[PDB]
């Protein structure tokens, strides 16, 4: 019960958010690379 | 010599006098406060200007206020 409060702290959630955002961007630039502009 | 000026927004908490390292400040009786006392700076020629009194003041803006002026051998705090 006290663990979920620690996971709800600012550094843990900002790390989870940044890893999720970086993973989404990396998985996008793997499957759809080299997008300098919208065609 | 520096100018230590005490204004009328003083609660008489005596924190400036206990924070002062060169006995510049003291407490005088005062009818305009709940604590019945206000700070005064008689021997302000001994003030170095460290502003420890300004650090310890609990007013929103400080009732005790140090103005750095002419520099003497005591304002510089020189052992030589």
């Amino acid at each position: 019960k006290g663990l979920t409060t620690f996971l709800s702290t600012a550094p843990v959630l900002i790390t989870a958010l940044l890893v999720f955002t970086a993973g989404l961007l990396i998985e996008f630039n793997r499957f759809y690379p080299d997008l300098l502009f919208h065609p | 010599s520096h100018s230590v000026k005490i204004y009328d927004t003083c609660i008489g908490c005596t924190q400036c006098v206990r924070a002062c390292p060169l006995d510049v400040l003291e407490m005088v009786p005062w009818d305009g406060c709940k604590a019945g006392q206000i700070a005064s700076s008689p021997r302000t020629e001994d003030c170095v200007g460290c502003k420890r009194c300004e650090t310890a003041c609990p007013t929103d803006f400080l009732s005790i206020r140090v103005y750095l002026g002419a520099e003497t051998t005591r304002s510089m705090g020189l052992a030589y």
């Binding site: 620690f6 630039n29 690379p33 | 200007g49 460290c50 705090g77 030589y80």
Partner: protein
């Protein structure tokens, strides 16, 4: 006297304090009213003395945190062994170690960073590592990647064991205060049981594993027909066919017939001509000798049985006329203060790491270590930087000892009291020797710049010009070159080819040459002494003037880490013991940067290079240290401008990450000066302007945004300065030496 006594379950293991940050400090527990709370959460997270006043709880926290740090280090080591096992060309490198570069990290191809996978040989693409793990595993007798995988698994198991021990020694069975005060038992078990038994076990490994596998490797046997190290023990016939004194048993050890062990316990001294490393017989004999010496030294101190010393009567008996009372009070200082122990241990570990750096370049312990110039340059630079950081941290913790753990009642007329009593005479003469060294080490360079600029090459401080030959170091070099056979009659060669002899060369490249010292070496060694002395001056001035001065006499009540006392007395800015560490970080940057620049130029110009078939050595730069390392323009032109041609032309190649890191370190160095030059009261007013714009759109944060504090502003500035400079020098060094080496 020395017994095991613990408290059972002193701290319960619950997650309720995980969700309550700032629990360790009373001031941090009121809640984050301002953003200074967030930085105070990290600044005081490990300062266990400010958390609790009981030394037993502090020592328990320290003992349990050491296990977590060891678990982190073991996770790191297991990760390195796993990268050697899975993502490396170590099996390819063992077949051809003279034409295949060591690589242990592949780069994922999601963006154009697939170019960062360098072509290193054997059909493997990856980053050319310079850590020297490959040469370390070759010296350890590791022949296949499964032995690295097993070591990685063992590192994970040991890291989990250390984590469990850290939980156990804080939440299940935590030792008392007097379990820490008996440093006699601790030091006996660290000398004999940790250093002695560790070096004895490594001596046994080097006898049974490293020596036969490495002798078969140097004899020309491919590693996948080389037998595994356990049939060398299980079948002693294969172990005794080479080095044939294993035919006789262990009885010559016990009858003191040690001489027949001379085939595999040698004192050859020099480098292996086949590999360029030290003889592994010399290393095994060395580890056995220092194991016996450390085990003997671990029986010095009285623990439980009457025999031994108590480390107090040794201190009590050491007293003279110039001191009087002596070392009385120092045992209580070192057994009641953790900061004095950290200041001693961190200084000795820093100087030890610097010794490691200065020794592994001249006497390379590993096969094909001196051949790969990148590994040697990287380990030298890395260990200099680590050692200097530890020395500055020692100055820091001496300053923390002086205001937080020093007691004047226990220290009357001893050594520490008298150092405090003549600190003005200490610091003023250190200031004079710093000024003298600065003038007569840097004004020589300024004079040489001036006379080379004014067309006066005969008025300079050069070998052709007015000479400044380091006659004492040359005499010591002559003593070491003639040491084998005269003062060390049972050494086949000298300890290193540095002091004399011939060019040790492996393949086509030079392992080591003699390093002749001239006017440039004299002048740069005096700059080394100067920069070391100024770092000593700032750190020691922070130590001695930590409690009081003529400026601020009541400075111990302000603490170790405070910004200033005010604008009075002219302005008492950066008076604290912390700010002397802050300035000493800049000066260790300057010192160690000049050290690694001297190394990277002297070895490239006068040691490293290729061997022509005629016999002459063609160096990397061409021996320009003799004439260009005497001028600042020569250091700028022939070293910084000339050798950074590789790091700036690295784009579109396999070393372009080094050019990226070069520019990134330049960015972080420039970014540091915003924090270093400016002050808090600018940024507080700027944040006040931003707060109103947030208030206009209902964007007021609950935690009020404050500017970083003055000490935190200095800390951020110095951390960015060191990071940006060190990353820059790392990138420059590695991209230069991965192109010319």
């Amino acid at each position: 006297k020395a017994k095991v006594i613990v408290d059972k379950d002193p701290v319960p293991t619950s997650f309720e304090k995980w969700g309550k940050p700032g629990h360790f400090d009373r001031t941090l527990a009121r809640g984050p009213k301002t953003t200074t709370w967030i930085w105070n959460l990290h600044a005081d997270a490990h300062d266990f003395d400010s958390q609790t006043s009981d030394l037993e709880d502090i020592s328990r926290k320290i003992f349990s945190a050491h296990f977590g740090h060891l678990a982190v280090v073991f996770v790191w080591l297991s990760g390195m062994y796993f990268h050697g096992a899975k993502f490396s060309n170590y099996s390819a490198w063992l077949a051809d170690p003279l034409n295949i570069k060591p690589s242990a990290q592949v780069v994922w191809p999601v963006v154009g960073q697939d170019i960062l996978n360098a072509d290193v040989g054997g059909g493997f693409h990856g980053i050319q590592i310079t850590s020297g793990f490959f040469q370390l595993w070759r010296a350890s007798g590791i022949t296949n990647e499964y032995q690295l995988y097993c070591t990685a698994i063992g590192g994970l198991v040991m890291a989990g064991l250390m984590l469990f021990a850290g939980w156990f020694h804080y939440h299940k069975a935590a030792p008392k205060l007097e379990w820490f005060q008996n440093v006699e038992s601790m030091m006996n078990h660290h000398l004999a049981g940790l250093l002695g038994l560790g070096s004895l076990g490594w001596a046994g490994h080097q006898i049974h594993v490293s020596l036969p596998i490495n002798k078969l490797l140097d004899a020309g046997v491919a590693p996948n027909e080389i037998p595994l190290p356990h049939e060398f023990i299980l079948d002693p016939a294969k172990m005794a066919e080479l080095y044939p004194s294993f035919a006789q048993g262990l009885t010559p050890f016990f009858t003191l017939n040690w001489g027949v062990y001379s085939d595999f316990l040698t004192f050859k001294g020099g480098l292996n001509p086949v590999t360029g490393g030290l003889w592994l017989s010399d290393t095994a004999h060395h580890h056995l000798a220092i194991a016996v010496l450390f085990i003997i030294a671990g029986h010095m101190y009285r623990t439980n049985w009457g025999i031994g010393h108590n480390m107090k009567e040794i201190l009590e008996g050491h007293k003279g006329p110039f001191t009087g009372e002596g070392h009385k009070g120092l045992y209580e200082i070192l057994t009641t203060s953790w900061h004095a122990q950290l200041a001693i241990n961190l200084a000795l570990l820093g100087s030890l790491t610097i010794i490691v750096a200065q020794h592994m370049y001249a006497m390379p312990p590993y096969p094909y270590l001196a051949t790969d110039y990148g590994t040697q340059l990287s380990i030298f630079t890395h260990h200099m930087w680590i050692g200097g950081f530890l020395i500055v941290g020692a100055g820091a913790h001496a300053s923390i000892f002086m205001v937080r753990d020093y007691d004047p009642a226990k220290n009357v007329n001893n050594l520490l009291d008298r150092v405090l009593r003549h600190r003005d005479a200490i610091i003023s003469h250190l200031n004079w020797v710093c000024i003298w060294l600065g003038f007569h080490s840097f004004g020589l360079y300024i004079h040489n710049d001036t006379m080379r600029a004014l067309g006066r090459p005969q008025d300079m401080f050069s070998d052709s010009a007015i000479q400044l030959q380091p006659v004492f170091a040359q005499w010591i070099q002559g003593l070491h070159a003639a040491a084998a056979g005269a003062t060390a009659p049972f050494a086949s060669a000298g300890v290193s080819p540095v002091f004399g002899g011939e060019v040790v060369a492996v393949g086509g490249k030079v392992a080591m040459m003699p390093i002749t010292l001239g006017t440039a070496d004299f002048m740069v060694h005096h700059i080394h002494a100067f920069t070391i002395h100024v770092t000593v001056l700032i750190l020691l001035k922070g130590v001695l003037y930590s409690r009081s001065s003529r400026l601020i006499p009541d400075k111990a009540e302000l603490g170790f880490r405070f910004p200033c006392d005010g604008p009075g007395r002219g302005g008492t800015c950066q008076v604290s013991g912390w700010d002397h560490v802050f300035l000493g970080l800049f000066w260790m940057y300057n010192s160690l940067s000049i050290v690694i620049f001297h190394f990277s130029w002297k070895m490239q110009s006068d040691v490293w290079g290729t061997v022509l078939p005629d016999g002459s050595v063609s160096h990397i730069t061409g021996g320009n240290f003799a004439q260009s390392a005497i001028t600042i323009n020569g250091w700028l032109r022939d070293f910084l401008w000339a050798q950074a041609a590789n790091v700036i032309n690295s784009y579109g190649s396999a070393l372009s990450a080094y050019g990226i890191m070069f520019l990134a370190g330049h960015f972080v160095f420039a970014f540091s000066l915003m924090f270093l030059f400016s002050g808090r009261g600018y940024w507080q007013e700027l944040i006040e302007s931003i707060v109103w714009a947030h208030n206009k759109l209902k964007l007021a944060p609950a935690i009020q945004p404050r500017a970083l504090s003055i000490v935190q502003g200095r800390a951020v500035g110095v951390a960015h300065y060191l990071l940006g400079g060190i990353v820059t020098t790392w990138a420059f060094f590695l991209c230069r030496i991965l192109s010319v080496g």
